[PDB]
Scaffold this active site. Structure first.
Site, short mmCIF file in Angstrom:
data_model
loop_
_atom_site.label_atom_id
_atom_site.label_comp_id
_atom_site.label_asym_id
_atom_site.label_seq_id
_atom_site.Cartn_x
_atom_site.Cartn_y
_atom_site.Cartn_z
N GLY A 11 12.96 2.30 -28.09
CA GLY A 11 11.74 3.33 -27.57
C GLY A 11 12.16 4.64 -27.09
O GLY A 11 13.43 5.01 -26.97
N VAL A 18 16.17 5.78 -27.32
CA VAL A 18 17.29 4.80 -27.00
C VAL A 18 17.39 3.80 -28.32
O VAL A 18 16.27 3.47 -28.84
CB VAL A 18 16.97 3.70 -25.96
CG1 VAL A 18 17.94 2.60 -25.90
CG2 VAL A 18 17.14 4.65 -24.67
N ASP A 119 13.56 8.05 -10.80
CA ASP A 119 12.43 7.58 -11.84
C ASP A 119 12.60 6.49 -12.01
O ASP A 119 12.50 5.77 -13.26
CB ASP A 119 12.59 8.39 -12.94
CG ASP A 119 11.32 8.26 -13.94
OD1 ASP A 119 10.32 7.91 -13.57
OD2 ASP A 119 11.38 8.62 -15.32
N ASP A 137 19.46 4.39 -16.31
CA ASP A 137 19.14 5.57 -16.24
C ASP A 137 19.52 6.32 -14.88
O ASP A 137 19.13 7.46 -14.52
CB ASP A 137 17.82 6.05 -16.75
CG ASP A 137 17.86 5.95 -18.29
OD1 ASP A 137 18.80 5.99 -19.02
OD2 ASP A 137 16.62 5.82 -18.86
N1 LIG Z 1 11.11 -3.97 -24.99
S1 LIG Z 1 12.39 -4.97 -24.61
O1 LIG Z 1 11.89 -5.55 -23.59
O2 LIG Z 1 12.15 -5.64 -26.10
C1 LIG Z 1 13.79 -4.14 -24.57
C2 LIG Z 1 13.67 -3.14 -23.43
C3 LIG Z 1 15.14 -2.44 -23.41
C4 LIG Z 1 16.26 -2.92 -24.04
N2 LIG Z 1 17.42 -2.38 -23.82
C5 LIG Z 1 17.67 -1.12 -23.59
O3 LIG Z 1 16.63 -0.20 -23.67
C6 LIG Z 1 18.74 -0.59 -22.73
N3 LIG Z 1 19.87 -1.49 -22.79
N4 LIG Z 1 20.85 -0.99 -22.16
C7 LIG Z 1 20.19 0.29 -21.69
C8 LIG Z 1 20.94 1.44 -20.94
C9 LIG Z 1 20.26 2.58 -20.76
C10 LIG Z 1 18.97 2.77 -21.31
C11 LIG Z 1 18.44 1.73 -21.92
C12 LIG Z 1 19.28 0.60 -22.06
C13 LIG Z 1 16.01 -4.05 -25.00
C14 LIG Z 1 14.76 -4.43 -25.34
#
Ligand SMILES: NS(=O)(=O)c1ccc(NC(=O)c2n[nH]c3ccccc23)cc1
Length: 280
Positions: A11, A18, A119, A137
């Protein structure tokens, strides 16, 4: 950068897209963020030493072709999705309390190094299968569609030199949201954000926040709402949880509880580490 095969886009974040990605040498799966002022390079490089188990690990910083890619440890789910998936019954209080406790540890760490997040929001709180939760972040806002819901009132009132207290405010709002299963202050503009805060917590004045009236964006014309009682704001949270939340949401950033003092709060007397049940 060719050392990475993108597996999927996760997203659009505040600082770039990312990606879930796999390292072609190491085999490791990571989060790859594509974000160059030398100042940004050095701040970001500081963040690589800022290591704590409730802080998503920055693995690598790849300055290439005048571009900036940050390589992080990867987590499978964020707190927003987990909240959504939990919304029928809500997150159980012992897991809320564990998450809040771990995130306060994370904050206490970064704050003791003078690093703030600025944030915090559900989308950058990442969870795993072992019951850990991690802040993602951290420190980026300083090294460098916008949600306002978790913004501290001193930022909205135009304070340019705000403190670690802003993270405590954000985290208080997240705590409330996990409990009630609704955003505490879902503002859709800066004035709507401020006035939602005022309507719940009371319009701030010189009595509760010395110096408020001299802030850059403070207006004597602000309407004067009376504070609501926390019992109406976050039932069915118990007295210890409401008491802690109240201290996290103090108007005056100097009165606001620190992450370190929050960890000693009685609410955490019976804290445990449950495992959530997560569907990946
Ligand atoms: N939308 S969801 O719940 O499926 C989902 C959300 C988030 C991540 N994982 C990430 O975005 C994520 N992992 N390590 C990071 C380090 C820094 C920024 C983002 C990072 C995976 C899946």
């Amino acid at each position: 950068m060719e050392n990475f095969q993108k597996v999927e886009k996760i997203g659009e974040g505040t600082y770039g897209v990312v990606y879930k990605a796999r390292n072609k040498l190491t085999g490791e799966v990571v989060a790859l963020k594509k974000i160059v002022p030398s100042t940004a390079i050095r701040e970001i490089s500081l963040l690589k030493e800022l290591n704590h188990p409730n802080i998503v690990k920055l693995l690598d910083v790849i300055h290439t072709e005048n571009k900036l890619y940050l390589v992080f440890e990867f987590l499978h789910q964020d707190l927003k999705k987990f909240m959504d998936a939990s919304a029928l019954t809500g997150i159980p209080l012992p897991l809320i309390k564990s998450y809040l406790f771990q995130l306060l540890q994370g904050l206490a760490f970064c704050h003791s190094h003078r690093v703030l997040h600025r944030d915090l929001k559900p989308q950058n709180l990442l969870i795993n299968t072992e019951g850990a939760i991690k802040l993602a972040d951290f420190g980026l806002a300083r090294a460098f569609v916008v949600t306002l819901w978790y913004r501290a009132p001193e930022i909205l009132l135009g304070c340019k030199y705000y403190s670690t207290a802003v993270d405590i405010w954000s985290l208080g709002c997240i705590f409330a949201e996990m409990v009630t299963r609704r955003a505490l202050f879902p503002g859709d503009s800066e004035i709507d954000q401020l006035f939602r805060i005022f309507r719940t917590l009371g319009t701030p004045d010189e009595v509760v926040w010395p110096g408020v009236t001299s802030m850059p964006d403070y207006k004597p014309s602000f309407p004067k709402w009376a504070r609501q009682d926390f019992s109406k704001v976050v039932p069915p949270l118990d007295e210890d949880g409401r008491s802690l939340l109240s201290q996290m949401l103090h108007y005056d950033p100097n009165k606001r509880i620190s992450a370190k003092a929050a960890l000693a709060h009685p609410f955490f007397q019976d804290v445990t580490k449950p495992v959530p049940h997560l569907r990946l």
